């Protein structure tokens with residue numbers, strides 16, 4: 675059961691970025707974003723995930739203010755967590 679503030683499927687930004695809560699049901703391969711092979715990409719290893727926001731598997735994403743994403747999710751703004 676997703677948190678009340680989870681990013682949802684008719685969120686316009688989620689649609690535009692092709693977010694999914696489950697990276698295995700994402701188009702990460704098609705996008706081929708740089709920094710890791712696409713099968714290795716998900717929110718937990720993304721620069722925009724906010725480790726100090728949320729709880730458990732439901733964490734912040736800077737691009738989705740006021741929302742939570744799933745650490746196992748993905749979107750097309752995936753960028754390696756570098757610092």
Ligand code: SF4
Nearest residue numbers: 717720722723735749
């Ligand atoms: S920007 Fe990164 S942390 Fe935010 S939803 Fe996309 S992949 Fe997940």
Ligand SMILES: [N+]
Nearest residue numbers: 678679680682
């Ligand atoms: N939500």
Ligand SMILES: [N+]
Nearest residue numbers: 692700701704
């Ligand atoms: N597609």
Ligand SMILES: [N+]
Nearest residue numbers: 734735736739
């Ligand atoms: N956030």
